[PDB]
């Protein structure tokens, strides 16, 4: 097998953790390290359990030598520093656990400049670049505010690599739903599209992991990392994606510009209905547009002519109207805005969908495969969106806007009400 694996496996028996009746060895699988059922397991069977003594959460850092100095930091920043530091101490509780952690994953946060060029024009690149920079500024701030003014607690220097290594280990291993917890033993199961339950989470302290599927002997025990993450999210959080086109998403960002002559009123309408000055709408392949996207698009493109809808008079129905539609001019405007954005975006990629699909037909390397898959999907979504609005441009006269809806209850053909007027 592998030295480190045993130096870690044993350390688990010597901690009391892995008992004698735990059907699950740790072997090498296509996805690195994994848990292979030592014998037939069945739905909901407890695979293993670990002592809170072994976690690595915001409480562990607070209840440690550096908890005082990290008393103010956000939880994820706190944990990174603890991880980096614990890693340096050749007398840390997790000396052997650190000896098993991969020095890297396929998460876009580790991709070289060449590998990242494979994502040119993708929203995943923007997101990865944006996240990388932000974790950087945050970690350079931690260096001068805590790491440097305390060289006693932080002996060895800390590089950007040191931080990123940790930020990754936290993003691809920590168990959220229980919010950041590490569990050296159960921190081995891999993800499988086969699992569709997501019930594995459980704790009697003691972390208890149970197999969601029935696994025969020799096979690998899996779990569903997350049924809702988009492919772009799986790519950055862990180092992998799924072929399932229903995981492809593209998130649209909307906002009420401050240079908008009706900013104040518009903002009041949006917040009054659950939306901020800035709103993010996730668009998944083959799904129907998110509720609120169209009305918010209409609010953004409002304009002088229909500005009358922002008066106190409609401050109680304005959203219902935005939901139905405002006017052909408003509708036509937003449709073009979206369509242009899609085309603009689509043109930012360096490969066609056909090229991506042909590439997929051959043998691609982990990261290259991730890039191709992601970009093909984003292009699919982008085109789906543009298609939806191209159709709306055609059906531009099938919609009954405000004015029409208004004159629907005129009652022109009522009675000769003048006969009564003369009877008093
Ligand atoms: N279905 C899958 N395909 C590819 N890699 C996977 C995977 N499920 C899990 N992984 C890998 O394992 C990580 C989760 S931690 C699980 C243990 C890991 N296999 C190891 O050897 O250390 C992920 O971030 C990813 O790099």
Coordinates of C-alpha atoms and ligand atoms in Angstrom, one line a residue:
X1 CA 0.0 0.0 0.0
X2 CA 1.9 3.1 1.3
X3 CA 4.0 4.0 4.4
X4 CA 2.2 7.2 5.4
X5 CA -1.1 5.3 5.0
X6 CA -0.1 2.8 7.7
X7 CA 1.5 5.4 10.0
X8 CA -1.9 7.0 9.9
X9 CA -4.0 3.9 10.0
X10 CA -2.2 2.6 13.0
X11 CA -2.3 5.9 14.7
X12 CA -6.1 5.5 14.5
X13 CA -6.1 2.1 16.3
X14 CA -3.7 3.6 18.8
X15 CA -6.2 6.3 19.5
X16 CA -9.0 3.9 20.0
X17 CA -10.8 5.1 17.0
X18 CA -10.8 2.3 14.4
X19 CA -11.9 -0.7 16.3
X20 CA -11.7 -4.4 15.3
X21 CA -15.1 -4.5 13.8
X22 CA -15.0 -1.6 11.3
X23 CA -15.7 -2.9 7.8
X24 CA -13.7 -0.5 5.8
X25 CA -10.0 -0.4 4.9
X26 CA -8.2 2.5 3.3
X27 CA -6.9 1.7 -0.2
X28 CA -5.7 3.5 -3.3
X29 CA -8.5 4.2 -5.8
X30 CA -8.7 6.1 -9.1
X31 CA -9.7 9.1 -7.0
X32 CA -6.6 8.8 -4.7
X33 CA -7.3 7.5 -1.2
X34 CA -10.6 5.9 -0.3
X35 CA -12.6 3.6 1.9
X36 CA -13.1 0.1 0.6
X37 CA -15.7 -2.1 2.5
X38 CA -13.8 -4.8 4.3
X39 CA -17.0 -6.8 4.0
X40 CA -20.6 -6.4 2.8
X41 CA -22.1 -3.2 4.2
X42 CA -25.7 -2.0 4.0
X43 CA -27.7 1.1 3.8
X44 CA -27.3 3.3 6.9
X45 CA -24.6 1.1 8.4
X46 CA -22.1 2.9 10.6
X47 CA -18.7 3.0 8.8
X48 CA -16.6 4.7 11.5
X49 CA -16.6 7.1 14.4
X50 CA -14.2 9.8 15.6
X51 CA -13.8 11.7 19.0
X52 CA -14.4 15.5 19.1
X53 CA -10.9 15.3 20.6
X54 CA -9.8 15.0 17.0
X55 CA -11.8 17.8 15.3
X56 CA -10.2 20.9 14.0
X57 CA -12.8 23.7 14.3
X58 CA -13.0 27.3 15.4
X59 CA -13.2 25.9 18.9
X60 CA -10.0 24.1 18.5
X61 CA -8.2 27.3 17.5
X62 CA -9.8 29.3 20.2
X63 CA -8.9 26.7 22.8
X64 CA -5.3 26.8 21.6
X65 CA -2.2 28.9 22.0
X66 CA -3.3 31.2 19.1
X67 CA -7.0 31.5 20.1
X68 CA -6.3 34.8 21.8
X69 CA -4.8 36.5 18.8
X70 CA -7.4 35.1 16.4
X71 CA -10.3 36.0 18.7
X72 CA -11.5 38.5 16.2
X73 CA -10.7 36.8 12.8
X74 CA -13.5 35.2 10.8
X75 CA -13.7 31.4 11.4
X76 CA -12.1 30.3 8.1
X77 CA -9.2 32.7 8.5
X78 CA -8.7 31.3 12.0
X79 CA -8.7 27.7 10.9
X80 CA -6.1 28.3 8.1
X81 CA -3.6 29.8 10.6
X82 CA -4.2 26.9 13.0
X83 CA -3.6 24.4 10.1
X84 CA -0.5 26.1 8.8
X85 CA 0.9 26.4 12.3
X86 CA 0.0 22.8 13.4
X87 CA 1.6 21.6 10.3
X88 CA 5.0 23.2 11.3
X89 CA 4.9 21.7 14.9
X90 CA 6.5 18.3 14.7
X91 CA 4.7 17.5 17.9
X92 CA 1.2 18.3 16.7
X93 CA -1.8 16.0 17.5
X94 CA -2.2 15.6 13.7
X95 CA 1.4 15.0 12.8
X96 CA 0.4 11.8 11.0
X97 CA -2.8 13.2 9.6
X98 CA -0.7 16.0 8.0
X99 CA 1.5 13.2 6.6
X100 CA -1.4 11.9 4.5
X101 CA -3.0 15.1 3.2
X102 CA -2.3 15.6 -0.5
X103 CA 0.0 18.6 -1.2
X104 CA -2.5 19.6 -3.8
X105 CA -5.9 18.8 -5.4
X106 CA -7.2 19.7 -8.9
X107 CA -9.0 22.7 -7.6
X108 CA -8.5 25.6 -9.9
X109 CA -6.8 27.4 -7.1
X110 CA -3.6 25.4 -7.8
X111 CA -3.7 25.5 -11.6
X112 CA -0.6 27.0 -13.4
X113 CA -1.0 29.9 -15.8
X114 CA -1.1 27.5 -18.8
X115 CA -3.8 25.3 -17.2
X116 CA -5.9 28.3 -16.4
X117 CA -5.7 29.6 -20.0
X118 CA -7.9 26.6 -20.8
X119 CA -10.7 28.4 -18.9
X120 CA -10.3 31.7 -20.8
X121 CA -13.6 33.6 -20.9
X122 CA -15.2 31.2 -18.4
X123 CA -17.1 32.4 -15.3
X124 CA -15.2 29.8 -13.4
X125 CA -11.9 31.7 -14.1
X126 CA -13.3 35.0 -13.1
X127 CA -14.6 33.3 -9.9
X128 CA -11.3 31.6 -9.2
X129 CA -9.2 34.7 -10.0
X130 CA -11.5 36.8 -7.8
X131 CA -11.4 34.3 -4.9
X132 CA -7.6 33.8 -5.2
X133 CA -6.9 37.5 -5.0
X134 CA -9.4 38.0 -2.0
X135 CA -7.8 35.1 0.0
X136 CA -4.5 36.7 -0.8
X137 CA -5.3 40.2 0.5
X138 CA -6.9 38.6 3.5
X139 CA -3.8 36.4 4.2
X140 CA -1.3 39.3 3.7
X141 CA -3.4 41.2 6.2
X142 CA -3.2 38.3 8.6
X143 CA 0.6 38.3 8.2
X144 CA 1.1 41.9 9.3
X145 CA -1.7 41.9 11.9
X146 CA -1.1 38.6 13.7
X147 CA 1.7 36.5 12.1
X148 CA 4.4 39.2 12.3
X149 CA 3.5 40.9 15.6
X150 CA 3.7 37.5 17.2
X151 CA 6.8 35.7 15.8
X152 CA 6.9 33.7 19.0
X153 CA 3.7 31.8 18.2
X154 CA 4.5 31.7 14.5
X155 CA 8.2 30.7 14.3
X156 CA 8.7 29.7 10.7
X157 CA 7.8 32.2 7.8
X158 CA 4.4 31.8 6.0
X159 CA 4.2 32.1 2.2
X160 CA 1.1 32.4 0.0
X161 CA 1.6 28.7 -0.8
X162 CA 1.3 28.0 2.9
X163 CA -2.1 29.8 3.1
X164 CA -3.5 28.4 -0.2
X165 CA -2.5 24.9 0.9
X166 CA -4.7 25.3 4.0
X167 CA -7.6 27.2 2.3
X168 CA -7.8 24.2 0.0
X169 CA -7.7 21.5 2.6
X170 CA -10.5 23.4 4.3
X171 CA -12.7 23.8 1.2
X172 CA -12.3 20.2 0.0
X173 CA -12.5 18.3 3.2
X174 CA -14.4 20.1 6.0
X175 CA -17.9 18.8 6.9
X176 CA -20.2 21.8 6.7
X177 CA -23.8 20.6 7.6
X178 CA -23.9 19.7 11.3
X179 CA -19.6 25.0 10.3
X180 CA -16.1 23.7 9.5
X181 CA -15.1 20.4 11.0
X182 CA -12.2 18.0 10.1
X183 CA -12.3 14.3 10.8
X184 CA -9.0 12.4 9.9
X185 CA -10.8 9.0 9.6
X186 CA -14.1 9.8 7.9
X187 CA -12.2 12.4 6.0
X188 CA -11.5 9.9 3.3
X189 CA -14.8 8.9 1.6
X190 CA -15.0 10.1 -2.0
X191 CA -18.0 11.5 -3.9
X192 CA -20.2 9.4 -6.2
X193 CA -23.0 10.4 -8.5
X194 CA -24.6 7.1 -7.4
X195 CA -25.4 8.5 -4.0
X196 CA -28.5 10.7 -4.2
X197 CA -29.6 10.9 -0.5
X198 CA -27.2 13.0 1.4
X199 CA -27.9 11.7 4.9
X200 CA -24.4 10.6 5.9
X201 CA -24.0 13.5 8.3
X202 CA -24.5 12.4 11.9
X203 CA -22.9 12.6 15.4
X204 CA -23.6 11.0 18.7
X205 CA -18.7 14.0 21.3
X206 CA -18.3 11.6 18.5
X207 CA -18.4 11.9 14.7
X208 CA -20.4 9.1 13.2
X209 CA -20.3 8.4 9.4
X210 CA -22.7 5.9 7.9
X211 CA -22.8 4.4 4.4
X212 CA -25.8 5.7 2.4
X213 CA -25.6 2.8 -0.1
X214 CA -25.3 -1.0 0.2
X215 CA -21.7 -1.9 -0.7
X216 CA -20.5 -5.4 -1.3
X217 CA -17.0 -6.5 -0.2
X218 CA -14.1 -5.1 -2.2
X219 CA -16.1 -2.1 -3.4
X220 CA -15.7 1.5 -2.4
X221 CA -18.0 3.3 0.0
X222 CA -19.2 6.6 -1.3
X223 CA -21.2 9.7 -0.5
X224 CA -22.9 12.7 -2.2
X225 CA -20.8 15.7 -1.5
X226 CA -23.6 18.1 -2.5
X227 CA -26.7 17.7 -4.7
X228 CA -27.0 21.5 -5.3
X229 CA -23.5 22.7 -6.1
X230 CA -23.0 23.6 -9.8
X231 CA -20.2 22.0 -11.8
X232 CA -18.2 25.2 -11.4
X233 CA -18.6 24.9 -7.6
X234 CA -17.4 21.3 -7.6
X235 CA -14.5 22.3 -9.7
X236 CA -13.2 24.9 -7.2
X237 CA -14.3 23.3 -3.9
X238 CA -12.9 19.9 -4.7
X239 CA -10.9 19.0 -7.8
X240 CA -13.7 17.4 -10.0
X241 CA -16.9 17.8 -12.0
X242 CA -19.7 15.5 -13.2
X243 CA -20.8 14.8 -16.8
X244 CA -24.4 15.4 -15.8
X245 CA -25.4 18.5 -17.8
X246 CA -27.8 19.4 -15.0
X247 CA -24.9 20.5 -13.0
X248 CA -23.9 23.2 -15.5
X249 CA -24.8 26.7 -14.3
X250 CA -24.0 30.3 -15.0
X251 CA -24.8 33.0 -12.5
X252 CA -26.0 36.4 -13.7
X253 CA -25.3 39.4 -11.6
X254 CA -27.8 42.3 -11.5
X255 CA -27.8 45.6 -9.8
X256 CA -29.5 49.0 -9.6
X257 CA -26.8 51.4 -10.7
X258 CA -26.5 54.5 -8.6
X259 CA -26.2 56.6 -11.7
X260 CA -29.8 55.6 -12.5
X261 CA -32.0 58.7 -12.2
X262 CA -34.5 56.7 -10.2
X263 CA -32.0 54.8 -8.0
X264 CA -33.5 55.7 -4.6
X265 CA -37.1 54.7 -5.6
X266 CA -35.9 51.5 -7.4
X267 CA -33.8 50.4 -4.5
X268 CA -36.7 50.9 -2.2
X269 CA -38.9 48.7 -4.4
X270 CA -36.3 45.9 -4.7
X271 CA -35.4 45.7 -0.9
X272 CA -39.1 46.0 -0.1
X273 CA -39.4 42.7 -1.9
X274 CA -36.3 40.8 -0.9
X275 CA -33.6 42.0 -3.2
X276 CA -30.5 44.1 -2.6
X277 CA -28.9 46.8 -4.6
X278 CA -27.0 43.8 -6.1
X279 CA -28.5 40.4 -6.7
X280 CA -27.1 37.2 -8.0
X281 CA -29.2 34.8 -10.1
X282 CA -27.9 31.2 -10.7
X283 CA -29.1 29.8 -14.1
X284 CA -28.9 26.0 -14.4
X285 CA -29.1 24.1 -17.7
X286 CA -32.5 22.9 -18.6
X287 CA -34.1 24.7 -15.6
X288 CA -36.7 27.5 -15.7
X289 CA -35.5 31.0 -15.0
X290 CA -35.2 31.8 -11.3
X291 CA -38.2 33.6 -9.8
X292 CA -37.4 37.3 -9.5
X293 CA -35.0 37.5 -12.4
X294 CA -37.4 38.9 -14.9
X295 CA -39.1 41.4 -12.5
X296 CA -35.6 42.6 -11.4
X297 CA -34.5 42.9 -15.0
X298 CA -37.6 45.0 -15.7
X299 CA -36.9 47.2 -12.6
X300 CA -33.4 47.8 -13.9
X301 CA -34.5 48.7 -17.4
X302 CA -37.5 50.8 -16.1
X303 CA -37.0 54.2 -17.6
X304 CA -38.7 57.6 -17.6
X305 CA -41.9 56.6 -19.5
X306 CA -42.9 54.0 -17.0
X307 CA -41.3 55.7 -14.0
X308 CA -44.8 56.5 -12.8
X309 CA -45.0 53.0 -11.4
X310 CA -42.6 54.0 -8.7
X311 CA -45.1 56.3 -7.0
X312 CA -46.5 55.6 -3.5
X313 CA -49.7 54.6 -5.4
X314 CA -48.3 51.3 -6.5
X315 CA -45.9 50.7 -3.6
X316 CA -48.1 47.7 -2.9
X317 CA -48.5 46.1 -6.3
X318 CA -45.4 47.3 -8.2
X319 CA -43.8 43.9 -7.8
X320 CA -46.9 42.1 -9.1
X321 CA -46.8 44.4 -12.1
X322 CA -43.0 43.9 -12.6
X323 CA -43.9 40.2 -12.4
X324 CA -46.5 40.5 -15.2
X325 CA -44.6 43.0 -17.4
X326 CA -44.4 46.8 -17.7
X327 CA -44.4 47.7 -21.4
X328 CA -43.1 46.6 -24.8
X329 CA -40.3 49.2 -24.6
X330 CA -39.2 48.0 -21.2
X331 CA -39.4 44.3 -22.3
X332 CA -37.6 44.9 -25.6
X333 CA -34.8 46.8 -23.8
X334 CA -34.0 44.2 -21.3
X335 CA -34.1 41.4 -23.9
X336 CA -31.4 43.1 -25.9
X337 CA -29.3 43.8 -22.9
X338 CA -29.3 40.1 -21.9
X339 CA -28.8 38.8 -25.4
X340 CA -25.9 41.2 -26.0
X341 CA -24.3 40.1 -22.7
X342 CA -24.6 36.4 -23.7
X343 CA -23.0 36.9 -27.2
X344 CA -20.4 39.2 -25.6
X345 CA -19.6 36.5 -23.1
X346 CA -19.7 33.6 -25.6
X347 CA -17.2 35.4 -27.7
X348 CA -14.8 35.4 -24.8
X349 CA -14.0 31.7 -25.1
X350 CA -11.2 30.3 -27.3
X351 CA -12.9 27.1 -28.3
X352 CA -16.2 26.1 -29.9
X353 CA -18.5 23.7 -28.2
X354 CA -17.8 21.2 -31.0
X355 CA -14.1 21.4 -30.3
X356 CA -14.8 20.8 -26.6
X357 CA -17.0 17.8 -27.4
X358 CA -14.4 16.3 -29.7
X359 CA -11.7 16.8 -27.1
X360 CA -13.9 14.9 -24.6
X361 CA -14.0 12.0 -26.9
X362 CA -10.3 11.4 -26.3
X363 CA -8.2 11.0 -23.1
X364 CA -7.9 14.2 -21.2
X365 CA -5.9 14.9 -18.1
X366 CA -7.7 15.7 -14.8
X367 CA -7.4 19.5 -15.0
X368 CA -7.7 19.7 -18.8
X369 CA -10.9 17.5 -18.5
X370 CA -12.2 19.8 -15.8
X371 CA -11.6 22.9 -18.0
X372 CA -13.2 21.5 -21.1
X373 CA -16.2 20.1 -19.2
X374 CA -16.8 23.4 -17.4
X375 CA -16.4 25.7 -20.5
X376 CA -18.6 23.5 -22.7
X377 CA -21.3 23.7 -20.1
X378 CA -21.0 27.4 -19.6
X379 CA -21.4 27.8 -23.3
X380 CA -24.4 25.6 -23.3
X381 CA -26.1 27.7 -20.6
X382 CA -25.1 30.9 -22.2
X383 CA -26.7 29.8 -25.4
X384 CA -29.8 28.4 -23.7
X385 CA -30.3 31.8 -22.0
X386 CA -29.8 33.7 -25.3
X387 CA -32.2 31.3 -26.9
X388 CA -34.9 32.0 -24.3
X389 CA -34.7 35.7 -24.8
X390 CA -34.5 35.4 -28.6
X391 CA -37.9 33.8 -28.3
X392 CA -39.1 36.5 -26.1
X393 CA -38.1 39.0 -28.7
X394 CA -40.4 37.2 -31.2
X395 CA -43.3 36.9 -28.7
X396 CA -42.8 40.6 -27.8
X397 CA -46.4 41.3 -28.7
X398 CA -48.0 38.4 -27.1
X399 CA -47.4 39.9 -23.6
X400 CA -50.1 42.1 -22.2
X401 CA -48.3 45.0 -20.5
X402 CA -49.4 47.5 -17.9
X403 CA -51.5 49.8 -20.0
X404 CA -53.4 47.0 -21.7
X405 CA -54.0 45.3 -18.4
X406 CA -55.3 48.7 -17.2
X407 CA -58.0 49.2 -19.8
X408 CA -59.2 45.6 -19.5
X409 CA -61.9 46.7 -17.1
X410 CA -63.4 49.7 -18.8
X411 CA -66.9 48.4 -19.1
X412 CA -67.6 50.5 -22.2
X413 CA -70.5 48.1 -23.2
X414 CA -72.3 48.5 -19.9
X415 CA -75.8 50.0 -19.6
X416 CA -77.3 53.3 -20.8
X417 CA -76.4 54.7 -17.3
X418 CA -77.7 58.1 -18.4
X419 CA -81.3 56.9 -18.0
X420 CA -80.7 56.6 -14.2
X421 CA -78.8 59.9 -14.0
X422 CA -82.1 61.5 -15.0
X423 CA -84.0 59.7 -12.2
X424 CA -82.7 61.9 -9.4
Ligands
LIG1 N1 -15.6 11.4 -7.6 C1 -14.4 11.9 -7.4 N2 -13.6 12.1 -8.6 C2 -12.4 12.6 -8.4 N3 -11.7 13.0 -7.3 C3 -12.5 12.8 -6.2 C4 -13.8 12.3 -6.2 N4 -14.3 12.2 -4.9 C5 -13.3 12.7 -4.2 N5 -12.2 13.1 -4.9 C6 -11.0 13.7 -4.4 O1 -10.8 13.6 -3.0 C7 -11.0 14.8 -2.3 C8 -12.0 14.6 -1.2 S1 -11.2 14.1 0.3 C9 -11.2 12.3 0.0 C10 -9.9 11.6 0.1 C11 -9.0 11.8 -1.2 N6 -9.4 10.8 -2.2 C12 -7.5 11.6 -0.9 O2 -6.8 10.7 -1.5 O3 -6.9 12.4 0.0 C13 -11.6 15.7 -3.4 O4 -11.3 17.1 -3.2 C14 -10.9 15.2 -4.7 O5 -9.6 15.7 -5.0

